[PDB]
Point group: none
């Protein structure tokens, strides 16, 4: 019935972002600028309310010193960007349940995407899948093949 | 080369865990007990200093008694049926004392939902678009297909138990 | 040939822990959480099945009135921990015999370890050993027990 | 406020069957032992007298007829399996749980050299090391010597 208000996501990000993309301390003015952009507000409302929108990215960018943030639905890489991605666990974010129990969180660094994805596949997805299953064998093998593929791309820079 | 002290990871977890595995508030007593276990101190120390240990899992479990909450910290990444977890993966072989801890870790949450669904969601909603976003701007198109096959495979696995 | 299932050990601890580490009553929820950890299941399985693992420790810790349990193979002291140590009598715990006949049990308190050990040596080990030998290296071992007892007594006295 | 003898009896009625029997209720043999006059006096002493440190509950079999006996004296018997209780403080207080005030050690019918070797090697030595890692080195070495002494005594009769 009740979709969470945008302010619930803003408040959550003011607390979470400083822990994951900064060295602690309070939410920087730069992050507050991003949370208040009209575009950002509409992207965040869409994420909260629309079952077809699954993700939101908080991206911290530096230029040569100068820190900037941006909020958008699109999950992507940037050479001088470090990001936090939120994935909804259910189609809509319920105003009546805690927000943290409705999201999955992943961080995405400025490393080569081949390295970052290799690391997530090799160190998290592969053992988590094996832990459960120990078509399933065919999916275990595809995880292994994806891991190798990514390792090759990473080695071939 | 100076390795970060285990207190650096404890302090970080005290702040982060409540935002990700609880509904905010202070670090619960159950978490502090898990952070002070001798076994956990050992596991955390290996994570900080041993290039061969890539990961650490903070696992929050619930038991029916009304619910009893327990935490446990260990290197092994696994699923639990009434467990919601935070996994840390190191970006480099050792965690350096002289840089912020948050800059040296990758974080992923792992819920109590069916792992087929959890993994489908990470592959479909993060791994796929992150990869495609990068290659758009020769193994590469074959890895893109492999991600699509993995995605579909996890989708079918979930569908089969719904 | 048949190794006892981890559930045999869980059941035994559910009954025993409340009498030795609590004031009776039912197995606390804190103990049940410790008993179902994956790390704990693996440690307990290794204790039951592997000749090179001799012990398992059930450790009760207090924080701040907040009680936590943890199960692990390693025998150690903790400043606000009271523990129950099980030592196997044989290399492998046999499924076909009662579990209690296959274990030795020792409790290890939150007291200074000098005092705890002094007490076990002077009140149990010494008189047990003497009872047996009285009923060529044996007098030499008796002397070693007395030296150890003395040494532990002095270590405790030094921090009093 | 010193503990009454019934506090120790009740505790033994619950503990003994877990440690010296295969569970079940306290056998009549244990109840007979807890009501002997000699046992009652010894238990009373244990509770109240600073110079009595220990009490043993000893389970004996005769070819199987089961017998129990409670006495202060800690000793081995070839047909006996025992539970030893050691007081942590000079007297046992009624106002605190009795379990918090005792140390417990089981003592089996195995060769005493083997039982003692096992306690020293698997409990005392790592417990002491864990502490002195977090005169002490001389005691660590005496532990190792005792361990070795017991090992050799057991090997010699194998
Ligand atoms: Ca912007
Ligand atoms: Ca634990
Ligand atoms: K924008
Ligand atoms: Mg700023
Ligand atoms: Mg960039
Ligand atoms: Mg949806
Ligand atoms: Mg708590
Ligand atoms: Mg501990
Ligand atoms: Mg739960
Ligand atoms: Mg783990
Ligand atoms: Mg600093
Ligand atoms: Mg991170
Ligand atoms: Mg992933
Ligand atoms: Mg299907
Ligand atoms: Mg069994
Ligand atoms: Mg409890
Ligand atoms: Mg061992
Ligand atoms: Mg305590
Ligand atoms: Mg062995
Ligand atoms: Mg065996
Ligand atoms: Mg001390
Ligand atoms: Mg001993
Ligand atoms: Mg009674
Ligand atoms: Mg005394
Ligand atoms: Mg006697
Ligand atoms: Mg040893
Ligand atoms: Mg030693
Ligand atoms: Mg020697
Ligand atoms: Mg010899
Ligand atoms: Na008698």
């Amino acid at each position: 019935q009740n979709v969470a208000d945008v302010s619930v996501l803003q408040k959550h990000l003011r607390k979470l972002v400083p822990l994951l993309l900064e060295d602690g301390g309070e939410a920087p003015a730069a992050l507050e600028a991003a949370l208040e952009e009209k575009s950002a507000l509409e992207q965040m409302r869409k994420f909260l309310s629309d079952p077809q929108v699954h993700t939101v990215l908080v991206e911290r960018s530096t230029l040569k010193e100068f820190i900037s943030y941006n909020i958008n639905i699109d999950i992507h890489y940037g050479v001088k960007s470090n990001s936090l991605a939120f994935i909804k666990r259910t189609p809509v974010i319920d105003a009546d349940k805690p927000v943290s129990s409705q999201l999955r969180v992943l961080t995405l660094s400025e490393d080569s995407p081949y390295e970052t994805l290799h690391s997530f596949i090799s160190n998290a997805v592969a053992p988590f899948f094996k832990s459960y299953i120990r078509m399933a064998p065919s999916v275990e093998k595809k995880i292994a093949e994806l891991e190798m593929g990514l390792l090759h791309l990473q080695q071939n820079i």
